[PDB]
Structure 1
């Protein structure tokens, strides 16, 4: 399991540097331990000696239904909890709609295709609609009020705030059972904030660390990690376990394709976006 980074402070790292590591997004001794010097050195106010002391002392201690049956079959029954699933597609393909649907379906009983856990929606694009969550809840006969009470929401204004919310998510996810973490327009802040060309490596490093934190949180809490990508990077490939390509069919009916999964076939399924739901295509 995890080894929360608090224990690293008893090794004699000072607590301020541990706070800087938590701000960076390292929350376990496992997390600090299996990384090279440069990760800790790149943090502001950390020299090579402090990074070597951290690594040295760290080595001492150490299926959610989509609600579309065709899509569930495409996924062999739904998202695997504990792993990151990326859905990349054009704008208006229904990524946000799928997120809203899953934010409620996660709360469904496991026998009903849920995870019996609360949902987490981190929004960067303003598209969060509690009324859509209410619609999905009424679709499955779930209490809309309890759905909104079991979904904690916060809009990230920048990449630093986007990573900082993970610090609150890790501590908050310990007290209550969650099953779904949603990050909508996850890549948008890396394009709007970091727009220059010399700063590309900085946003790539921040994204890499963010993805590693996502995988860490997935393995730590056994929750589903959902991130949304606008396709107007090869780094996500090794990190994402299931890549879904979304494209528009005219009207409100969307085509979904699987474009990489080591376990799931590359395959396609047709679905629609209905007021209640993300739901099977009904010609």
Structure 2
């Protein structure tokens, strides 16, 4: 695991400022050593000289089934543990049910289409539903009551706590083998929180921190990371180790396409959404 930020006190920083770092959620020395001086300087009383000391002294220490075989075959087995995946499309194209299916199935053995561990569900949109989680759990044979907690939960309602929950995971995601992280409607908070067209630079620089912590967690704990993107950009196409477009036919018929990847060709697969979560295009 990572060097926890508590050790930085033995490296020299006063314990009060180390606790102000832990109150910023910065619970690892590694999780500050790979970030700019500004993120420390912005903490109250932790000046430029303290950020100089923090980073100098830091160097003393520093596949999951979507529930659909066809969508998993577009994913060449399902979501890889230790990655970011992004899916984008119009409203109700599948995001919440994709997430509820993955948040459960990541707890399976890897052979059974799992990642052998817990999920975090950073719900930007209030669409966590115990009924829907239990419907996937009883289908895939996981303990339904434990799924409600192994899917570790909080509603996010600004990008800041959508992102500071990743810093809380720099503690909490040490504490078990998480297989997965979900941020559901991840881009919507960058559109609600910075909506005046004089404010967009704050969306950009805040989105960089968020995507940094996603890929860090994917390297730091080996989590898969799933981010769902509303439609009615290229930085998220960079961070996503493969990108995906979601569409629809008549009935609950769905299609996904790989649209960007350095590794995989542009390819398509057919799926559906059911009373028991995401599934194949059966009839």
Q: Provide closer, same or farther for how the CA distance between residues 36 and 138 of structure 1 changes in structure 2, counting only shifts above 3 A.
A: closer
**CA deviation vs aligned residue, 1:96-151 (integer Å, no higher than 9, x gap):** 11001111111122221112212221111111111111111121233322322422
Helix, strand or coil at the partner of 1:183: strand
Deviations 1:35-70 (A, max 9, x none): 343443344544322222222222233211222111
Residues 23 and 164 of structure 1 are in contact (CA less than 8 Å); yes or no, is this contact kept in structure 2? no
Q: 1:7 is paired with a residue of what secondary structure?
A: helix
Pairwise CA distance, 1:85: 0.7
Kept after mapping to 2: 8 A contact 1:124/1:155: yes
Q: For 1:222-233, what aligned pairs fall within 5 Å after superposition?
A: 222-233=222-233
Secondary structure class of the residue paired with 1:51: helix
How many angstroms does 1:155 deviate by? 0.8
SS of the residue aligned with 2:262?
A: coil
TM-score, normalising length: structure 1: 0.91
Q: Distance in 2 between matches of 1:36 and 1:168?
A: 19
Give the superposition deviation at 1:20.
4.2
Structure 2: unaligned runs, 5 residues or longer: none
User: 3-state SS of the aligned residue for 2:251?
Assistant: coil
Deviates more, 1:32-41 or 1:207-216: 32-41
Partner SS state of residue 85, structure 1 = strand
Q: Is the 8 A contact 1:90 1:246 kept in 2?
A: yes
CA deviation vs aligned residue, 1:232-268 (integer Å, no higher than 9, x gap): 3222122111111111223211110011222222211
How far did residue 277 of structure 1 move? 2.6
SS at match of 1:121: strand
Task: Let me know the Cα RMSD of the aligned residues.
Answer: 2.0
Q: Deviations over 1:204-223 (max 9, x none)?
A: 22221111111111211111
- Checking the alignment, whether the CA contact within 8 Å between 2:25 and 2:168 is kept in structure 1 is no
CA distance 1:186–1:22, shift in 2 (3 Å) = farther
Number of residue pairs the alignment of both structures matches: 283
Superposition TM-score, scaled by structure 2 size: 0.91
Contact conserved, 2:28 with 2:170, CA < 8 A, in 1? no
CA–CA separation in structure 2 for the residues paired with 1:240 and 1:68: 21
Uncovered stretches (5+) of structure 1, i.e. residues with no partner? none
In the TM superposition, 1:79-98 aligns within 5 A as 79-98=79-98
Please state how far the C-alpha of 1:199 moved relative to its aligned partner.
2.4
Q: Which whole-Å deviations, capped at 9, do the CAs of 1:14-46 have from their partners, x for residues lacking one?
A: 334334444555443233223343443344544
Secondary structure of 1:175's counterpart equals coil
